[PDB]
Amino acid sequence: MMITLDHVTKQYKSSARPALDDINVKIDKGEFVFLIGPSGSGKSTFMRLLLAAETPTSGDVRVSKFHVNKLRGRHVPKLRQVIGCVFQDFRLLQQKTVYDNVAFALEVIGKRTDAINRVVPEVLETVGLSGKANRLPDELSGGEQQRVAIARAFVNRPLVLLADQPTGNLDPETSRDIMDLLERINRTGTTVLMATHDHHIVDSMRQRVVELSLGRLVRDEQRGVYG
Amino acid sequence: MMITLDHVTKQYKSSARPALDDINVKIDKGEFVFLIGPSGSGKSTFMRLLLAAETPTSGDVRVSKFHVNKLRGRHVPKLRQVIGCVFQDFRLLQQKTVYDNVAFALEVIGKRTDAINRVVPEVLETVGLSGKANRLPDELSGGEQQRVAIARAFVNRPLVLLADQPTGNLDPETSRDIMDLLERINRTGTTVLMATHDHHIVDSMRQRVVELSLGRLVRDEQRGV
């Protein structure tokens, strides 16, 4: 089987409206899905549900490799090597350079230092951090501080790169190129999942756009646009 | 009677683009002022300049009362009651109530006890959430949590209510509720200084749009979309 989850829900305490119904969603491998949902209701619990940050109350979340709804004492990172996760905030390290932030996510999973210099400097020149890559991220502008967070996710070649509000707070002049960067990971076969609240940018390429209203899916279009 | 700043500078570790260089823009009492610009512009430093929370290296700052270029620390909170700010993260206390969050600037000043509760429903009647003012803000949805953040800064009458990223994470369906609320605020007679970071609303207002690019002033005509 491939990546398919259904019947997932997590009813929190003191919440008569947990905004998580049992929706049978279906995606395609190598296809991009845009989860432009509501505000403050359910745009992140579903987004962390693929990373299984919160244990669901019901249903069986599944990936194309193993079972996700049940774990053990040594299988929790085994889900999360293949997850490339980008938030709204930049969250770089302020004690190291841009060439070290990308490599920081490599010795934490047990990679030798000889393989660092043959893989890590073969990545950040593709995202656009080329030339010298020695500038400190504490002084760089936010246009280039986001793409290093993108390149930090694409280090072990993940098959999924889920992103929550990637543009976040940016002009369309510095967000139109973000689509041109993300399509280069999208055509590699990665099911990039973007949760956004910016219209008339996902209305251009007309890819698969889904949307929940207050806890239930209402739009399933494989080539739709945002309304 | 002018409330602006000019020939300011600010450097923390390196100069590079030292915040802003020189500002000559005419703003009036009751003007929608926008602050479109890229993320490297330092627009939050421009917020802190009018807040008198970041000391300028040069120039002067004076918002309609006195020059805060060399104002002492004794009188800096006195020029804060007339200043209002709203942010991204809604600045809400989880343990308090929806009534207790907007009834928080009352007791910190120390006004008359009869005038405490005589204004809180009077200002909850002009924000939109007139009702459901007893539920926990943790259980409230994020659409009306912003309106709590506007309605909190109405205990004292603000001469300017400057915003710092009040949308962008919100739905464009519920951005209408946020945006038209400020229109009725401006009909009281106060000015607001909008700082949104997208294109759809700035091509919807035809108001005084002020642009800023790393200190350089990009486009300034004080009208148009």
Add this chain to the structure above:
Amino acid sequence: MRFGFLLNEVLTGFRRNVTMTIAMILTTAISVGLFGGGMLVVRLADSSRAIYLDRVESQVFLTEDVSANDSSCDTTACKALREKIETRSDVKAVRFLNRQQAYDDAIRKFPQFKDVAGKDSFPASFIVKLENPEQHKDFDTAMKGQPGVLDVLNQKELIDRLFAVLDGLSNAAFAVALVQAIGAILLIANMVQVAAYTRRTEIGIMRLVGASRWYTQLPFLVEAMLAATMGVGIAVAGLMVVRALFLENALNQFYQANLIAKVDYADILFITPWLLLLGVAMSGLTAYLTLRLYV
């Protein structure tokens, strides 16, 4: 304005960081309790100094027939004994002490004969003071068996070991209390940082809406006030239980040995206001500039 708002907001800090506040109580209790215990043994040594004899002293007595008469140094038998001890340059002075002064201090030398033990019982003394209190064993043997002297008494040459261990215990308690107070100073700076970091969500609100500068530090300073008073109170209450559980069987018989006087549950009350004005000021001087230089 009215203090009805300060009282019902410190309970939020009393419930938010419970694992941090009571550690401060425990370490401030140890600090001012060790300081109080160090001051108590100094008070103990100063109260017990009057029982013994000082640095320059050597007690001597008189025979019964000489001390029965001669209420003042007027008979020739007095000068006959005084002159032979002014023949040698080892001593410097002899204090005029007689029978009448030997019972008004009988309460002082031994608080066990507080009854009417009886007049005309304690011998007259005529005690001497000498600047070289090491080579006086020959002096004591010259005063042994001499026709006119009963006996001598000495509190030096390995008798005044009581004060040497009391001073050492006092300085040890003072040193451990001092380094514990240095640790307490650092925990002052940490709890205000914890209260700033966890409860920052209204500090920015009060900074924006126009709170006065002094009122911002008031909830964090009253936290340090209640922490310091609670710590000093638990330290004083701990001094009672550490005396009552296992020091009412080992310390009390020194009085029946007539070595040290009363220490009771009263002289700690004379140092408890000094413990308050030390601990609360020690907390509050160091909880002010941390909020000035960081908030």
Add this chain to the structure above:
Amino acid sequence: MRFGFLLNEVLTGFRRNVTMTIAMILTTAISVGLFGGGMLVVRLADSSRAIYLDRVESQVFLTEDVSANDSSCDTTACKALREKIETRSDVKAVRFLNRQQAYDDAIRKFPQFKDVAGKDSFPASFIVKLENPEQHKDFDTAMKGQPGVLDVLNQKELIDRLFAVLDGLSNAAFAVALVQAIGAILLIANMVQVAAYTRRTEIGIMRLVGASRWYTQLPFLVEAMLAATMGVGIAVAGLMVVRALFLENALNQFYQANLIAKVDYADILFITPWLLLLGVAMSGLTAYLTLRLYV
């Protein structure tokens, strides 16, 4: 094993909060070294009691009417007891004490009470020495009211009652050590809620990168272990300078009397491994389970 990655982050972690770090150093040094000082006085107590077992003398008194009318043991009443005691499995030799010499041997030992001590107040006695003077329960159930004895002194608890005030000091040190050790455990417990908070920006990412669950709290543990071991390292160093500066004259003044076991630097260094393992255990067991409830 990727040790160089852990070797350089710990300096940045210490620079993130050196204030809380040195606070934990101080409270660890005090709580551990004060327990070590409590152990050292326990060592001194029984080690200075053990230099008396070869010289402690068990004594049993005699009744008056076998000693009031005769000086030496010549009557047939004491002729049974004179060699009944040599018929024993744990007695070296028996020496009879005449009543005439047992009066004035006290006067010869100290010329005091030469007129008030009763002539018929010191009964005659014998001499018994045991291979087990501490285990003198043999004579407790054998020396009954025999015809010729008055009472049984039951060897002596005099040395045992004498060496009990330092036992009170030892369990005082143990009580203060546990009380401050609770605060030390709590300061370990909130070490990591500010150590993880000051560097959230990378511990919040290796959760969502794929790092192992064991390797998350490992650099938040190793710095606490290093803090504990340098705290124990300065604890023994501070106990050196409270032994050699404040108690030093007190112990050298008992040096010439040879009454104390004289604990030396080898004796405090003898308890260093047990003290170090106690510090490592108290900062390892409690800096681990506080991360199971945090991360």
Add this chain to the structure above:
Amino acid sequence: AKLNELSRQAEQTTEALHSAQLDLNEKLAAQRAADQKLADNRTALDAARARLATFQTAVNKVAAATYMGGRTHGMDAILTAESPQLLIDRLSVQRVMAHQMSTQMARFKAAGEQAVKAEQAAAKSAADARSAAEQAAAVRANLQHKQSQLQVQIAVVKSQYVALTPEERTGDRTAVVQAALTQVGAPYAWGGAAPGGFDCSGLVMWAFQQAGIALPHSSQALAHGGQPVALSDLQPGDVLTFYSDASHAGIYIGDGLMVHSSTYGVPVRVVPMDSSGPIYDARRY
């Protein structure tokens, strides 16, 4: 008609001395016993003061003896001794020396308590003796007054009645049968306890005193505090004390032996035993 009442009132004056004499006797015995008990308590108080004085000299000698540095506890022996050899000897000596101290303190406290109790007992005994002397003086005070009042009736009976009335107007427990041989012709002597004066109830030695007895001669003590006797049971114990409280209780010598004087000198006639009227008149002894 006046020849009887002048001695009728005088009869109480005569018996007043005999009635008061027994009170006087018990009062003097009581004050003698009280004085003896007070003297014994004074001797006990002197002994208590002697033992208090010698134990006081002992406690002053031991209070002086500790002032020359005599330490008897044991804790400060390690503050005094310079070697473990003699430290053991110091502890061994002070262990029995403190026992001597405790016995001396207990003996002094017991002597003080005994002296206080003896002083209180001596004070109570002295108060009792002073009270007994007070009742002794009280029963003397009426005694010397009524002794002077006893001489009043002499002038009206032995002096006034002697001018007129000339020759015209005038078994085995007795063993005397006729007590009228030396008994008639004696018109009283002084109305008292004269041995031979023969005053009303003054005839008890010649009849009843035959085997010791030694009765107090009161006619009031045995009239109330005595064993009752019945005249109808052939027991001659009834007397002429009836219808007269605290009066003479003369036992008849046989049947109808009224040997007395009416006013001053009377003869004896065989008249019936008509003096026995109301109950509780006289008893046996």
